[PDB]
């Protein structure tokens, strides 16, 4: 039922992305961007479809996707964008700077819990069950499995719906300016990770 | 060292027609909702300081607050995350043009893990800071001679630290990093007052 | 089970001419200064419950508060240290005649280390409590049916729990120990509100 | 520094016709069921102390127990949680009109995490307590002058500490908080004797 | 299979003219000075068990205590450090001829770090031990059938386990190691009663 | 699945005229000085395995040791650090041409933190490895068929794992890193036997 | 006064006594890797014998005869270690022992510091230096400081035992201490056999 | 006597030898963020060469020739770090090395302290100060205390190595030590490739 377009290297064009907000996710060979290459970028406009883009080893360029990432009129939605921003900026040399993060939004609104993972959020906010089984798999394979392609699409298909709910909660609890300042700093927090401070809360006393 | 002591507020801003002011606070503790602001310290960088005693329940300090709100004047702190919280909580205005020597030390002094004011004054200025008066009753009606000297010393050197740290930030090409951190710092302090003082808001968990 | 849902307050105290009332609350979190009171639940012990939706900024609940301040009525909680704090912070009245089933469990169920409401209901009543709705948006304008049944079942069994624990407290000759703990509990909750929520005030360090 | 040394008990109560007495104890250790009470120290706050050696197997000390039972005389301890347990356990009498300087320190000295007797005596009185004789044989038939002086120095200043803490509790409006903690402290000590010494009875877990 | 429930004591020792007896206990908790002995379980190894309810304050159990003090009869426990301590504390007799399957397992089942009774019965005997009833009210006047069957299952297999462990201890030539551990075990339980329960008396620190 | 069981040694090397042999061991535990080698398992990668019971006190295994010493045959292990140590300790010969799938996994499966053989077989081969017989009595005279099948399953897949891991090592350009780790692996195992088993010899501290 | 010997005692003339204070120096805390280098003995008369042990030495007949003597109590501070390395080097496990650390843990219940330095400072007002503890004890020639540190760890063990024995009698723990000392050689054997990281009596 | 240079050794006249002592100073412990600032060399003759490395410098031909010479053993204390930052900066990973920290971990089994200061104090009775360690090593002009501190960290490595070789021989661990030194360049490569927080041989 869910249409998933799979691409090699880049989007063919931006026909599906003349929109004000785009959901973004990535798959990699690990959590360390200097060691673990970008393997997949996922995108959704919010219409129930997704694009899954395989990134080859040593790929330096993805003009259409990077046009989206640098377009200040388009908000990039992420879940825990701290990671996705870092590997994207590392790979293509462009740090997106108009972002919304559903993990940060959750930490500022779902104050009645300590579990802010995407699976827990989708279940509670949308009654949608996400599987994390394919997360630890070989994302650098020449041909992605059906299950990998569906996992990868599942991580962007719901971010618009989550963002809409979190914005209502941020308004209801009067934390919009707080959230906005956090989103403003998130790209620099990702840059700090790339520069060597990934283990350091830079605002902590010690 | 000339240390001018005041009750409630500065009498005027004659000593503060400057581009940056060093700011510090003493309190009854680390929890601003429980522990009242007790002293505000200022220095223009000229070797003198103003020590201002804040009374219990004091809601206003118009001259000092005009300094704190002046977007043309950078406020210099050491670990301003705490000072910004108690100042905004007490007088109702969050300064938003700031420089923090602790964030700056964490961005430049990468060869150490000690970023306290005493360690920094030692290494960068060969100045020895005493911290013995930090745990004392700062809400006392009359501050002791040693409290007043301690309270002054915490702002006397911040201008010199800033100038060194700015040189190192430039040398290592980290100016835009530090600027971005200083920009978020007031909101980081706000997040402390709102209830997130135990949470790294950017951590995975 | 019959569950009466109200906006703002009980309509009257016709169901609560009793010596003990079961009380519980739902909030937006564990930090009363940030996380508002959203729901208050009551039960007389007869299998029925009242679920009271508390609006944002609501300052009074005259009928509910009459019960909380009525010294002829014992208020039964599970971990009242929390409910007492958010009730007192929201409506300005700290209940002072209380029974806490968690303290009672810690004083009687010495053969275990789990003292949660779910474990206690399973062991003493063979009642299966579900905690799935605990993490939900309790500030929603319309509560879900799942939410309303969860909120109610957290008070339906406290009378039966209290009766069992009172027998255990008598068997093990610890009534006076428990009474003294119950008498301090309001002050323990007060201490949380004042800033000592992370401090065991009686510990050595 | 006048220190009267007695065996078994006070010879009489002539130095203790007062409304508050400073009390301390020395033991073979921290576990009252294994480690016997060895020394009981008293001071009226006049700069003298009575050090009372307690014998192995001793079940009574009538003059001391008359003081501890007297509802008209406040007993002042530093960390009376422990002293109350070992005295109630040895002589059968739990004092219930008490003042504890450690609890008072935690309620007032919010600018610090150090609440030992040494740190308090230094900051509030400029008095230097030595802790060297703390680990020594307090059951020794004959106590060294070092031991006798240590034992008396733990009661000589509690009156002066109390007065200062009373002024802080008044300044910060925590008088009724401190009172309620002092009221529960005997039960906190009873709880320790009954087997809950490792349990904060009010903790969630 | 056949479980015999007695009040207070065995009626006689007709079933216990044997060389070794499996012993187990149920209590109100892990702290013998606070948590009373409630049930004692015995088996001869013939597939039947005796389950003896011990009343509150019961000082005497003459047929049971005859077994405990009989130097010709090995008492078999699983983690007898605990059962020994509560029996000695309750009836005043410390058994000194013991075999512990948990110590034997730590000395023979070197290929694993799990040494509880459940995992040992599964591996050595393919017997499934349910631990659901471990946390129940063992001081209840009438014990449930589940309770009685759980309490008997903890002695029905200790003879079989002892035989297998003795074979493994002989295979690996550790018989004299185990014998000395069993000689010391009643003193290790005594050390717990005396106040050293948290202390490895043979550790460096 | 054909499994050949042998007492003492392989009858001959007819099935092992190959470039690489999968190797695994079963012991009485993780401490070679205490825990004797019990079983050695081999596979050529053809879907069959040989399982070799090693007797207590056995000092030679000529044909197996001939494979272990042959520099033209690569020995494949999962976590060979352990297997190399116990084979060297038992038969006095440390193999030196090895491939290890745990080290391989740590150098290629950077997208996970679980590098156990069960998890690797699951993800790379869709083969379900049961670890239930792991904690069993490997010194028994007669091994159960479940034990023999467990023992053979730990060598039946190591060839297929090796091939996949070699493709990953080439794709990520870590062949020479892996090779230096394997070259050092026998000395890492010697270090374990000599007494450094708990020390990372390259760590700062 | 400190007598330094090679390999063994010349005779047992100084050791016709009830109790001997015993101590060792090694290359570390692992007896299977770290060899026995020195053995120190005192009779309690304020003198000591320091016995350099050679690499590969398998016997020391006069010392071993002391360690074997059921009539002579061997006194240690933390004999768990010394018994292990003596048994592992010479094949004989002493079985008549007294350990001041266990004694201290059973009597000095007002403290958590049971090191030999604290016990000496408190019970004897004697200051023990530990500087030479980490030094090359396999050196062919031991320094004067090394030789005195070696001796100082046995010169006081008789005085400590007598104090502890009074504390044990005062608190009625004589039979508790005796059973601990009874088990202690086996606790040492358990260390030798592979259980050195395991409290054998713990629940887990 | 300490010779201070900019960028590189002028020539190799003082280093026609078998073993050179090597050390580095940096802006921190992360080679990808914290640049190499100083390289220190000593021939063991009581003198030292202190070389200041400029920001962005990619070559130092005379120094790199020493590091590449298989006939010259490079001596380090905790070479795992120095090898990483040298290979990252100049592109050459030295492969004939000796590490006094690894050797201390293989010989000084009677202690758990293996820092350079602690080792220099016990084996040479030389007192090292770590006060200048936390300082701005990227300064255009190094202070006198910085230059002296930088030199002192190479001045004694030759003497430490001789003592450790005697210990390794006495305890029969020469081959064990040689294999650790052989792997050490790969241990440092592993760090640069992203495994600096992982013991690659641990079970988990
Ligand atoms: N090592 C490790 N990597 C993870 C873990 N979770 C996610 N990753 C890596 O991070 C990438 C993004 O995670 P995802 O967006 O699938 O949750 C994955 O493709 C995987 O490489 C984890 O728990 N451990
Ligand atoms: N940087 C970082 N990202 C993580 C970690 N664990 C999971 N992630 C990332 O966080 C997202 C999913 O985390 P979740 O919030 O769902 O637990 C994915 O982007 C995944 O790669 C981690 O430990 N560090
Ligand atoms: N952060 C957090 N909040 C909780 C947790 N459990 C309960 N709460 C909050 O505390 C309130 C107490 O309600 P109850 O636990 O009785 O449902 C809940 O409504 C919820 O807001 C928890 O585990 N973590
Ligand atoms: N202070 C605190 N309260 C909790 C926590 N988790 C649950 N609670 C509260 O404790 C009560 C029931 O907890 P339970 O004992 O059932 O686990 C509810 O009021 C619930 O909100 C916690 O982690 N901390
Ligand atoms: N075990 C132990 N007992 C202590 C410690 N500190 C004090 N004690 C015991 O507690 C008694 C009273 O303590 P004080 O009033 O001297 O602080 C002392 O005589 C001593 O028996 C300690 O740190 N450990
Ligand atoms: N429960 C407990 N009491 C202590 C401890 N240390 C000292 N005490 C008791 O506390 C008092 C002295 O504590 P301090 O002077 O450190 O505040 C004495 O009464 C002493 O017995 C400890 O570690 N635990
Ligand atoms: N507090 C506590 N007590 C236990 C626990 N397990 C067993 N007990 C107590 O110890 C007694 C003996 O345990 P059992 O022989 O049933 O395993 C039980 O009757 C019960 O009172 C536990 O995990 N926690
Ligand atoms: N010290 C201690 N004893 C326990 C604990 N749990 C159970 N016990 C006691 O020791 C026995 C251990 O049983 P296991 O867990 O080995 O099957 C129980 O029967 C009970 O008597 C525990 O956590 N600590
Ligand atoms: N002590 C201990 N030994 C284990 C454990 N797992 C495996 N072993 C031992 O190590 C041997 C080899 O492990 P395997 O190859 O079966 O995974 C087993 O035969 C067993 O003796 C464990 O978790 N703990
Ligand atoms: N050093 C060590 N080895 C282990 C441990 N657990 C299992 N092993 C060994 O590692 C192998 C099992 O590896 P796994 O399947 O857990 O990756 C077997 O050879 C087993 O003996 C452990 O905790 N520590
Ligand atoms: N690794 C290490 N070994 C020690 C330590 N303390 C003592 N030793 C070793 O244990 C031996 C016991 O002798 P003593 O410590 O009484 O001088 C010493 O000779 C020394 O080899 C320590 O802290 N660490
Ligand atoms: N397990 C252990 N034993 C030590 C340690 N330090 C010293 N020892 C042993 O304990 C003896 C002295 O004990 P201490 O005086 O340190 O309490 C030494 O001779 C040595 O055998 C240590 O850190 N750990
Ligand atoms: N962050 C941090 N860096 C250190 C520390 N010690 C040394 N460094 C860095 O590592 C370099 C190594 O030089 P050394 O420590 O040999 O003087 C130093 O120049 C310094 O940059 C430390 O404790 N913390
Ligand atoms: N990982 C780590 N390395 C250090 C630390 N301090 C110093 N180092 C590194 O280790 C080298 C030697 O340190 P040392 O062994 O003297 O303590 C230094 O030159 C520096 O490169 C530290 O705290 N942690
Ligand atoms: Mn992601
Ligand atoms: Mn994803
Ligand atoms: Mn400040
Ligand atoms: Mn200050
Ligand atoms: Mn609740
Ligand atoms: Mn509830
Ligand atoms: Mn005291
Ligand atoms: Mn005292
Ligand atoms: Mn049991
Ligand atoms: Mn049982
Ligand atoms: Mn294996
Ligand atoms: Mn296996
Ligand atoms: Mn020793
Ligand atoms: Mn010694
Ligand atoms: Mn260095
Ligand atoms: Mn250096």
Do the Cβ atoms of H30 and B111 come within 8 Å?
A: no
Q: What is the DSSP letter of D53?
A: E
Do A92 and A83 touch, CB atoms closer than 8 A? no
In angstroms, rounded to a whole number, what is the distance separating the alpha carbons of residues B189 and B75?
Answer: 14
Reading across the β-sheet that carries A38-44, which strands appear in turn? A4-8, A50-54, A38-44, A21-28, A75-78, A99-101
Q: What is the DSSP letter of B53?
A: E
Any CB–CB contact under 8 A between G96 and chain E? no
Any CB–CB contact under 8 A between C134 and chain E? no
Q: Is B6 helix (H, G, I), strand (E, B) or coil?
A: strand
- CB contact set of F159 (below 8 Å; sequence gap of 6+): F20, F22, F43, F44, F45, F76
Q: Is the CB of F116 under 6 A from ligand 10?
A: yes
Reading across the β-sheet that carries D3-7, which strands appear in turn? D3-7, D49-53, D37-43, D20-27, D74-77, D98-100
Query: Which regions of chain G does DSSP assign to beta strands (E)?
Result: 2-6, 19-26, 36-42, 48-52, 73-76, 97-99
Torsion angles phi and psi, residue E188, rounded to 5: -65, -40
Matching residue, tokens 């006190």: F57
Torsion angles phi and psi, residue C98, rounded to 5: -140, 150
Contact list, F195 vs chain G (CB under 8 Å): 30, 32-34
Q: Is the CB of H139 under 6 A from ligand 13?
A: no
**Binding site members of G for GMP:** 25-26, 77, 101, 109, 112, 116, 130, 133, 149, 203
Any CB–CB contact under 8 A between H201 and chain F? yes
Resolution (A): 2.3
Q: CA-nearest residue of chain B to H26?
A: B111
CA of E57 to the centre of ligand 7 (A): 20
Q: Where are the alpha helices (DSSP H) in chain D?
A: 62-69, 80-91, 101-108, 117-125, 145-156, 158-171, 175-191
In angstroms, rounded to a whole number, what is the distance separating the alpha carbons of residues F66 and F11?
Answer: 12
| Mutation site for H-interface testing, chosen from G134, G137, G142, G149 by largest number of H Cβ within 10 Å | G134
Q: CA-nearest residue of chain B to D165?
A: B137
In angstroms, rounded to a whole number, what is the distance separating the alpha carbons of residues H116 and H150?
Answer: 13
CA of H194 to the centre of ligand 13 (A): 19
Q: Is the CB of C114 under 6 A from ligand 7?
A: no
Any CB–CB contact under 8 A between B34 and chain D? yes
Q: CA-nearest residue of chain E to C112?
A: E135
Do the Cβ atoms of D111 and B31 come within 8 Å?
A: no
Q: CA-nearest residue of chain C to B192?
A: C34
Q: Is F124 helix (H, G, I), strand (E, B) or coil?
A: helix
Q: How crowded is the C-beta side of A108, counted as CA atoms within 13 Å?
A: 33
- In ligand 5, the atom with minimum distance to the C-alpha of D35 is 21
CA distances from F1 to B61, E136, G201, H22 (A): 87, 49, 45, 58
Do the Cβ atoms of F200 and H201 come within 8 Å?
A: yes
- CB contact set of F36 (below 8 Å; sequence gap of 6+): F27, F28, F54, F56, F90, F139
Contact list, E123 vs chain F (CB under 8 Å): 135-136
Contact list, F114 vs chain A (CB under 8 Å): 136
Matching residue, tokens 């040298």: H86
CA distances from A53 to A16, A49, A64, A100, C81 (A): 14, 13, 11, 21, 53
- In ligand 4, the atom with minimum distance to the C-alpha of C82 is 19
Q: Is F43 helix (H, G, I), strand (E, B) or coil?
A: strand
CA of F30 to the centre of ligand 9 (A): 6
Identify the residue whose C-alpha is closest to ligand 2 atom 22: B204
Q: Is G52 helix (H, G, I), strand (E, B) or coil?
A: strand
| Mutation site for B-interface testing, chosen from C27, C36, C194, C195 by largest number of B Cβ within 10 Å | C195
Do D63 and D4 touch, CB atoms closer than 8 A? no
Which residue from B161, B154, B1 is spatially nearest to B83, judged by alpha carbons?
Answer: B154
Closest CA of chain H from A52, distance in Å: 28
Q: Is the CB of E129 under 6 A from ligand 7?
A: no
Identify the residue whose C-alpha is closest to ligand 3 atom 9: C29
Signed CA dihedral, A130, A134, A140, A145: sign only: negative
The answer to whether the annotation marks B200 as part of a ligand binding site is: no
Do the Cβ atoms of D111 and B34 come within 8 Å?
A: no
Partnered with residue F4 across adjacent β-strands are: F50
Site to substitute for ligand 3 among C22, C24, C27, C30, most atoms within 8 A of C-beta: C30
Q: What is the DSSP letter of D79?
A: S
Q: Is F63 helix (H, G, I), strand (E, B) or coil?
A: helix
Reading across the β-sheet that carries E49-53, which strands appear in turn? E3-7, E49-53, E37-43, E20-27, E74-77, E98-100
Any CB–CB contact under 8 A between C205 and chain D? yes
Q: Where are the alpha helices (DSSP H) in C18-79?
A: 62-69
Q: Is the CB of A95 under 6 A from ligand 2?
A: no
Q: Determined by which method?
A: X-ray
Contact list, H194 vs chain A (CB under 8 Å): 32, 34-36
In angstroms, rounded to a whole number, what is the distance separating the alpha carbons of residues D158 and A66?
Answer: 72
Breaks (C-N over 2.5 A) in chain B follow: none
Do the Cβ atoms of H135 and B123 come within 8 Å?
A: yes
Burial tier of F48 (Cβ tally within 10 Å: 0-12, 13-18, 19+): middle
Any CB–CB contact under 8 A between C195 and chain B? yes
Which residue from B187, B184, B173 is spatially nearest to A187, judged by alpha carbons?
Answer: B184
Burial tier of D89 (Cβ tally within 10 Å: 0-12, 13-18, 19+): middle
Nearest CB partner across the interface for G33, out of F31, F34, F194: F194
Closest CA of chain E from G57, distance in Å: 27
Do B78 and B158 touch, CB atoms closer than 8 A? yes
Q: Is the CB of F122 under 6 A from ligand 10?
A: no
Do the Cβ atoms of A112 and C28 come within 8 Å?
A: yes
| Mutation site for B-interface testing, chosen from H35, H56, H136 by largest number of B Cβ within 10 Å | H136
Strands B3-7 and D37-43: unpaired
Joined tokens for residue G200: 């054998």
**Binding site members of F for Mn(2+):** 24, 26, 83, 154
- CB contact set of H43 (below 8 Å; sequence gap of 6+): H14, H15, H17, H20, H21, H158
- CB contact set of G12 (below 8 Å; sequence gap of 6+): G62, G65, G66
Q: How crowded is the C-beta side of E170, counted as CA atoms within 13 Å?
A: 6
CA of C33 to the centre of ligand 17 (A): 25
DSSP state string for H69-123: -TTSEEEESSHHHHHHHHHHHHS----SEEEHHHHHHHH-TT-S---HHHHHHHH
CA of D131 to the centre of ligand 5 (A): 10
Which residue from F199, H96, A172, D140 is spatially nearest to C57, judged by alpha carbons?
Answer: A172
Angle between helices D158-171 and D101-108 (to 10 degrees): 30
Q: Is the CB of A132 under 6 A from ligand 2?
A: no
Matching residue, tokens 């599970």: C78
First to last CA, chain E: 48
Q: Where are the alpha helices (DSSP H) in E13-116?
A: 62-68, 80-91, 101-108
Q: Where are the alpha helices (DSSP H) in chain E?
A: 62-68, 80-91, 101-108, 117-125, 145-153, 158-171, 175-191
- CB contact set of C205 (below 8 Å; sequence gap of 6+): D115
Helix (H) or strand (E) holding A24: strand A21-28
Contact list, C77 vs chain D (CB under 8 Å): none
Do the Cβ atoms of B123 and H138 come within 8 Å?
A: no
């Amino acid at each position: 039922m869910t249409e998933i377009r799979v691409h090699q290297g880049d989007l063919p064009n931006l026909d599906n992305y003349r929109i004000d907000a785009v959901a973004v996710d990535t798959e990699t060979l690990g959590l360390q961007p200097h060691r673990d290459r970008l393997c997949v970028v996922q995108l959704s406009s919010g219409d129930g479809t997704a694009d899954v883009i395989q990134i080859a080893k040593g790929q330096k360029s993805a003009p259409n996707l990077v046009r989206l990432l640098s377009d200040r009129d388009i908000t990039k939605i992420f879940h825990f964008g701290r990671f996705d921003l870092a590997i994207l900026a590392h790979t293509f040399g462009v740090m997106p700077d108009v972002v919304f993060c559903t993990k940060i939004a959750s930490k500022l609104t779902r104050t009645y819990t300590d579990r802010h993972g995407l699976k827990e959020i989708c279940g509670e906010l949308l009654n949608v069950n996400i599987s994390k089984q394919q997360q630890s798999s070989d994302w650098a394979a020449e041909t992605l499995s059906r299950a990998q392609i569906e996992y990868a699409a599942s991580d962007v298909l719901y971010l618009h719906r989550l963002k809409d709910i979190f914005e209502e909660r941020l308004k209801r609890e009067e934390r919009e300016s707080v959230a906005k300042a956090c989103f403003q700093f998130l790209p620099m927090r990702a840059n700090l990770d790339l520069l060597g401070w990934s283990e350091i809360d830079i605002f902590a006393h010690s």
